[PDB]
DNA sequence: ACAGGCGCCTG
DNA sequence: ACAGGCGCCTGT
């Protein structure tokens, strides 16, 4: 849609375009309905280099952090190289510090503990793992390591369509077992979760948000939320799970990715030094040598002052396994370095340090995006817990696609008497 | 090309 | 507990 591209990033607008950074910013103050320091935006550099361990594990290089309680909207952009037009700068990310009460997240916390560490079945994902299927950044202990939780519908290779074609009412939230009431209680969490962040999609990221909504009255079987407007239809939960690089493919194109972090009680003040802590990671991407207002003294001050930490190399002893986890079917410790990934300085590494509560935005099927594995995993008193809300594409279809299946499989009866 | 996936169903 | 069916698409 322009007279200005392979390797300058993946483009797309409905999170946000502009000609410029200031243009963004427009954009940003019109959506929040704020002006000034409640909105911070910070330029970053795709580069196509990702950042990772020794051992191909998640690494950081730069820390995004909170600059006070005043900033209210963190905007990650991309300027890309070479272009003039109207859509010259993207947005990337969208972070709201402030984006659900402090008592539900508080009261969120300890509650989807509780309940996933005694019934949660554990949804095995292919970023679970590094490439070679051997790291343990989960933790080496079944009853304690990070894990990924799925809720809500998903798409199927099998049907092309929802999982739940062939359901007879199916379960949203299953837990081990068959415990109704448990599983009742987790329902009300997370939808009225989707409920409540439904509107932030909207104000935020209308556009996206829009997409997400063009077919809620087509299959609202597979849509979660109690309200009008139902964006989203799976979620899953992270339990100081370690999201090793990768894209989140089954979602559908043009929409995003709703992330709401709640964290461990020793980390939910603004001044403060947690015993440790879970980043999100974009490892195609550099920082940019300046600030949103083009100042290079600007962004050197946020260096100094913490509020773009400069992280430096680190060699730390990890367990790797004697054997690869198998597809679909001991250890030792290993040094694991990050030296190589710091001495290139256009190996990428961005990363943000969401806080309790916060909700952040991106186009998680496009955006290459990780998350820092912990010291300790420990889902039964995790780091830090994430809620992702999202759509899987081809979930269009009235009561997750029954129909369109038995029709498929009446096809098969026309076939057979011949 | 092609390995491998935020699976669930009947029997 | 199990076996066997239904098969799409993306990064490379
Ligand atoms: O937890 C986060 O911040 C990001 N999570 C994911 O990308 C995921 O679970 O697929
Ligand atoms: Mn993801
Ligand atoms: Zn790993
Ligand atoms: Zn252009
Ligand atoms: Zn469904």
């Given at each position: 849609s322009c007279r200005c591209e392979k390797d300058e990033g993946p483009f797309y607008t409905h999170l946000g375009?502009?000609?410029?950074?200031?243009?963004?910013?427009?954009?940003?103050?019109?959506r929040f309905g704020q002006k000034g320091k409640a909105i911070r935006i910070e330029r970053v550099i795709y580069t196509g280099k990702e950042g990772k361990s020794s051992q191909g594990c998640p690494i950081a290089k730069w820390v995004v952090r909170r600059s006070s309680s005043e900033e209210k909207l963190l905007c990650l952009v991309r300027e890309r190289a070479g272009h003039t037009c109207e859509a010259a700068v993207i947005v990337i990310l969208i972070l709201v510090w402030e984006g659900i009460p402090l008592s539900l997240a508080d009261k969120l916390y300890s509650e989807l503990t509780e309940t996933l560490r005694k019934y949660?079945?554990?949804?095995?994902?292919?970023?679970?793992?590094?490439?070679?299927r051997?790291?343990?950044?989960?933790?080496?202990?079944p009853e304690t390591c990070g894990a990924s939780f799925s809720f809500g519908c998903s798409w199927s290779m099998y049907y092309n369509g929802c999982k739940f074609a062939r359901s007879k009412i199916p379960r949203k939230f299953k837990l081990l077992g068959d415990d109704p009431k448990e599983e009742e209680?987790?329902?009300?969490?997370?939808?009225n979760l989707s409920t409540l962040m439904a509107p932030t999609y909207?104000?935020?990221?209308?556009?996206?948000?829009?997409?997400?909504?063009?077919?809620?009255?087509?299959?609202?079987?597979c849509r979660l939320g109690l309200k009008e407007g139902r964006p989203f239809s799976g979620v899953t939960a992270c339990l100081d799970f370690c999201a090793h690089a990768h894209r989140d493919l089954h979602?559908?194109?043009?929409?995003?990715?709703?992330?709401?972090?709640?964290?461990?009680?020793?980390?939910?003040?603004?001044?403060?030094?947690?015993?440790?802590?879970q980043l999100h990671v974009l490892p195609l991407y550099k920082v940019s040598d300046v600030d949103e207002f083009g100042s290079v003294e600007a962004q050197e001050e946020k260096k100094r002052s913490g509020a773009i930490q400069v992280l430096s190399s680190f060699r730390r002893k990890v367990r790797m396994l004697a054997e690869p986890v198998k597809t679909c079917r001991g250890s030792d410790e290993v040094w694991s370095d990050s030296e190589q990934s710091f001495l290139d300085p256009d190996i990428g590494g961005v990363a943000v340090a969401p806080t309790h509560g916060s909700i952040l935005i991106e186009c998680a099927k496009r955006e290459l995006h990780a998350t820092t594995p912990l010291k300790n995993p420990?889902?039964?008193?995790?780091?830090r817990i994430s809620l992702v809300f999202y759509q899987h594409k081809s979930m269009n279809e009235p009561k997750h696609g029954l129909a369109l299946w038995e029709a498929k499989m009446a096809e098969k009866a026309r076939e057979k008497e011949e």
């Open positions: 375009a502009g000609p410029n950074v200031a243009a963004i910013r427009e954009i940003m103050e019109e949660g079945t554990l949804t095995n994902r292919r970023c679970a793992l590094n490439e070679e051997t790291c343990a950044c989960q933790g080496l202990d209680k987790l329902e009300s969490h997370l939808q909207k104000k935020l990221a209308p556009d996206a948000y829009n997409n997400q909504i063009e077919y809620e009255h087509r299959a609202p079987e979602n559908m194109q043009n929409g995003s990715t709703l992330v709401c972090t709640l964290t461990r009680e020793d980390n939910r003040e603004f001044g403060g030094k947690p015993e440790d802590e420990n889902r039964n008193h995790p780091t």
